[PDB]
């Protein structure tokens, strides 16, 4: 996480995190700010409105050292910056009160240290916090899982 995950600043405040996956950088569109790394500041970010996220091709030096996405998602518990995140019934939740605004774009990690989703927002459901996250699929399909009342962090 620490090596390959760059905050976005705004007036000196972090309001999200950007991730370099599969040789390409990604950042969420609802957050507005300045990327920390200067080398990635010059990347022209192609915007995909449906995914509320911009993607770009990282330079040669950093294209070798990137996180890998994954498609297979054995249901259960998954790693995250704020601990273990729980997956069942095609939905990602966390114990309530964990995570909040400015945590957008932090990747979801698996056991072998590979990315399975990127957190975009949350809905606090009292017992837990439903997380609106973009995910992959078996058919190589990118899907924007968003629970009812999704609040884009």
């Amino acid at each position: 996480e620490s090596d390959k995950t760059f905050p976005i600043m705004l007036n000196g405040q972090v309001n999200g995190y950007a991730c370099v996956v599969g040789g390409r950088l990604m950042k969420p569109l609802h957050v507005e700010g300045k990327i920390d790394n200067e080398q990635l500041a010059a990347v022209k970010l192609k915007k995909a409105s449906m995914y509320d996220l911009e993607y770009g091709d990282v330079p040669q030096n950093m294209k070798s050292d990137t996180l890998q996405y994954t498609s297979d998602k054995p249901p259960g518990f998954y790693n995250w910056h704020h601990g273990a995140v729980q997956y069942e019934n095609g939905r990602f939740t966390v114990p309530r009160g964990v995570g909040g605004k400015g945590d957008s774009g932090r990747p979801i990690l698996d056991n072998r240290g590979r990315v399975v989703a990127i957190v975009l927002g949350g809905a606090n459901e009292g017992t837990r916090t439903a997380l609106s996250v973009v995910t992959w699929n078996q058919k190589g399909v990118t899907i924007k899982d968003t629970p009812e009342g999704s609040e884009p962090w």
Binding site: M50, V141, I143, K144
Partner: protein, 48 residues
């Protein structure tokens, strides 16, 4: 002149054919564009 000059008839059928072709090409094109947009919306709805 023994007859008044109208408009709806005082245009040659060949000229009418050309004019209709150049006016209907754009209409067909915009129809195809709307069709493609609708098909794309159905695909993106299905594959979300």
């Amino acid at each position: 002149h023994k007859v008044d000059q109208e408009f709806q008839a005082a245009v040659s059928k060949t000229s009418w054919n050309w004019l209709l072709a150049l006016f209907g090409g754009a209409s067909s094109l915009i129809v195809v564009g709307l069709i493609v947009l609708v098909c794309s919306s159905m695909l993106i709805n299905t594959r979300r």
